[PDB]
Design a protein around this ligand. Sequence first.
Ligand SMILES: CCCCCCCCCCC
Ligand SMILES: CCCCCCCCCCC
Ligand code: NA
Ligand code: NA
Ligand code: NA
Ligand code: NA
Lengths: 46, 46
Amino acid sequence: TIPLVCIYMLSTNILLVNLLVAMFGYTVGNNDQVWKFQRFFLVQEY
Amino acid sequence: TIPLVCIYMLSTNILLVNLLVAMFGYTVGNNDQVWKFQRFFLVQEY
Ligand SMILES: CCCCCCCCCCC
Ligand SMILES: CCCCCCCCCCC
Ligand code: NA
Ligand code: NA
Ligand code: NA
Ligand code: NA
């Protein structure tokens, strides 16, 4: 258990960070034109 | 239990806040140049 909680302290903080990257990764990387192209894109196929 | 839930009302709100600081602390403190230095940094060692 000297490394087994350090498994869970390393399992969390690589799945937790990947979860938090998923919540926030839309922010990094004109956003009315970036939207209005995609709103035009999706409605055009239907 | 007059203080024991106030333990848990103080345990949460110091671990919850430290969790929420972890989600949001990347925002505070040029971010194309701040990235492109680190993308150059990591690829250069490999
Ligand atoms: C093995 C458990 C280590 C602590 C888990 C706390 C993670 C909280 C995640 C809430 C999104
Ligand atoms: C002792 C429990 C006190 C309430 C816990 C609610 C915290 C929700 C955290 C969700 C990230
Ligand atoms: Na886990
Ligand atoms: Na997790
Ligand atoms: Na707690
Ligand atoms: Na918590």
